[PDB]
Ligand binder design. Structure first.
Ligand SMILES: Nc1ncnc2c1ncn2[C@@H]1O[C@H](COP(=O)(O)OP(=O)(O)O)[C@@H](O)[C@H]1O
Ligand code: BEF
Ligand SMILES: [Mg+2]
Length: 509
DNA sequence: AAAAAAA
């Protein structure tokens, strides 16, 4: 369809709750709720989104705004407004459906809705139910029946599982569709589900198949999403709202970025520990940080080290997809509340998760996708606070830092090399209690992980994978050693006819 | 065998 740009404007008349109230856009009850949150003033994207999202019964909406700049309320407020605008029509039906790439994010958005509810008990009538995977279906549906929610937040899969069973009962009158972190939801493995959801909701709707308004939000998107969103967009023209200049980088300016480069990938483990150690001393245990890792196993493994190396000083929270949803929710709450501590996680906590007052965002290795570099370091410097970011890598990963400059215009001015002392190496290797068999899996996971993103990050397959592989030897403290595997397994890997596979592995059946 | 996400 037709895309209409609305570029960033420096000379723009401000927008406030009071103005939007006096202008008649916002009813008193939502104003009352948002004002009590005692924000200085509406963030750019909020000022730019609210009126348009409510404005025409036509145009779809895309909105780009940097991390932690209030993109949530930027659509949660208009929704509530729309709910107030139609309180006598279909008062027991879902009118707004919000979708998010992870469960914790969905639950977080739900919690935000609950905050809105908390700031004004008059808005509790507009009930809200979350539909995410890893929780009891029956209970969720019991909640659905009980409350008759006007707002649903969900993850695609469970939402499909709900729709295929109860599309007629709750979802026959949706008017708004919200894709938070829209770009991720349009990636492979998500897009089909979103297209399915879109199809079902459009098919089921009573007024028309083009009734629903679609809202796309993310810190990272371009026009190339609209080509990917074409099948889920209904309206004839799309409203692109951008709080960022076209040339300007998507990364947040207030983030103090740096990158530590090592000879080997394993070294980055030593660099991170030495860095954290320095911070705890200089900050007197007043340290709140998030550290990212490529895989679940490397996360869990890194957690062991950090626990052995820093549990005297701080709490170490392990956070990844293989954690049960209860533990995830609880630890998320704890890290949200706690003043200090270290959150060791995969990319489950890369997008959208708002942990207040995080000092530093560390990264061992590279993200699952280029864009997720922006989101990762986005976990800090949120809501007007300052923040720092450190990227721990080795030379064989440097083509990634280059691709950060080429694609996203992101330049890390602060670079420096790193080589570990024998002391720190001894200290860390002493902190490893994992058997060789486990180390094997841990490194293999990294091999598999880094293999998948070679084409994406411009890596040299012949140079990168053996480096990742030698980690095994480094951890077992025998550099010349190779990972012991069976021929059939290496054949499953498909590297049996490769010099690399021979260079990284030792067939020991 | 490799974030996440449907069991
Ligand atoms: N208008 C505002 N002024 C100041 N802080 C805000 C405002 N709106 C939201 N926030 C804060 O921003 C934090 C995270 O914002 P979020 O909605 O996650 O932004 P994004 O989705 O763009 O990352 C929340 O803790 C919230 O309290
Ligand atoms: F809305 Be964002 F993903 F916090
Ligand atoms: Mg964000």
């Amino acid at each position: 369809s037709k895309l209409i740009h609305v570029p960033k404007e420096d000379n723009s008349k401000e927008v406030t709750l009071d103005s939007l109230l006096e202008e008649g856009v916002l009813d008193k009850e939502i104003h009352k709720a948002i004002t009590r949150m005692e924000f200085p003033g509406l963030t750019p994207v909020q000022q730019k989104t609210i009126k348009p999202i409510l404005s025409s019964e036509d145009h779809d909406v895309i909105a780009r705004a940097k991390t932690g700049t209030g993109k949530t309320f930027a659509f949660l407020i208009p929704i509530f407004q729309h709910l107030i605008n139609t309180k006598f029509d279909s008062q027991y039906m879902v009118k707004a459906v919000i979708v998010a790439p992870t469960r914790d994010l969905a639950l977080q958005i739900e919690a935000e809705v609950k905050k809105i509810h908390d700031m004004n008990y008059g808005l509790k009538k507009y009930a809200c139910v979350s539909l995410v995977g890893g929780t009891d279906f029956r209970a969720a549906m019991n909640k659905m029946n009980k409350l008759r929610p006007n707002i649903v937040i969900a993850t695609p899969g469970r939402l499909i599982d709900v729709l295929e069973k109860y599309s007629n009962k709750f979802f026959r009158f949706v008017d708004y569709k919200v894709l938070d972190e829209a770009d991720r939801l349009l990636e492979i493995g998500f897009r089909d589900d979103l297209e399915t959801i879109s199809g079902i909701l459009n098919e089921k709707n009573s007024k028309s198949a083009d009734n629903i308004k679609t809202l796309l939000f993310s810190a990272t998107l371009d026009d190339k999403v609209q080509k990917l969103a074409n099948n889920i967009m209904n309206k004839k023209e799309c409203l692109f709202l951008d709080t960022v200049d076209k040339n300007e980088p998507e990364a947040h300016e207030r983030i103090d970025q740096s990158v530590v480069i090592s000879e080997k990938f394993a070294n980055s483990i030593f660099a991170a520990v030495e860095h954290i150690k320095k911070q705890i001393k200089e900050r007197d245990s007043n340290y709140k940080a998030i550290i990212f890792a490529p895989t679940v196993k490397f996360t869990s493994f890194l957690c062991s080290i950090l626990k052995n190396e820093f549990k005297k000083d701080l709490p170490i929270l392990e956070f990844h997809g293989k954690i049960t949803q209860n533990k995830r929710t609880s630890l998320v709450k704890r890290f949200k509340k706690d003043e200090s501590g270290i959150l060791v996680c995969t990319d489950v906590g890369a997008r959208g998760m708002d942990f207040p007052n995080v000092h530093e965002v560390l990264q061992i290795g590279v993200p699952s996708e280029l864009a997720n570099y922006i989101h990762r370091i986005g976990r800090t410097a949120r809501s007007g606070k300052e923040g720092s970011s450190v990227l721990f890598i080795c030379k064989d990963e440097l083509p990634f830092v280059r691709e950060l400059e080429d694609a996203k215009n992101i330049v890390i001015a602060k670079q420096e090399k790193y080589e570990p002392s024998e002391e720190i190496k001894s200290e860390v290797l002493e902190a490893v209690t994992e058997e060789p068999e486990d180390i094997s899996d841990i490194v293999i996971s990294l091999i598999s992980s880094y293999r998948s993103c070679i084409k994406e990050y411009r890596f040299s397959e012949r140079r990168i994978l053996p480096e990742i592989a030698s980690t095994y030897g480094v951890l077992l403290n025998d550099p010349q050693l190779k990972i012991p595997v069976s021929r059939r397994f290496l054949d499953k890997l498909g590297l049996s006819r490769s010099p690399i596979g021979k260079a990284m592995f030792e067939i020991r059946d």
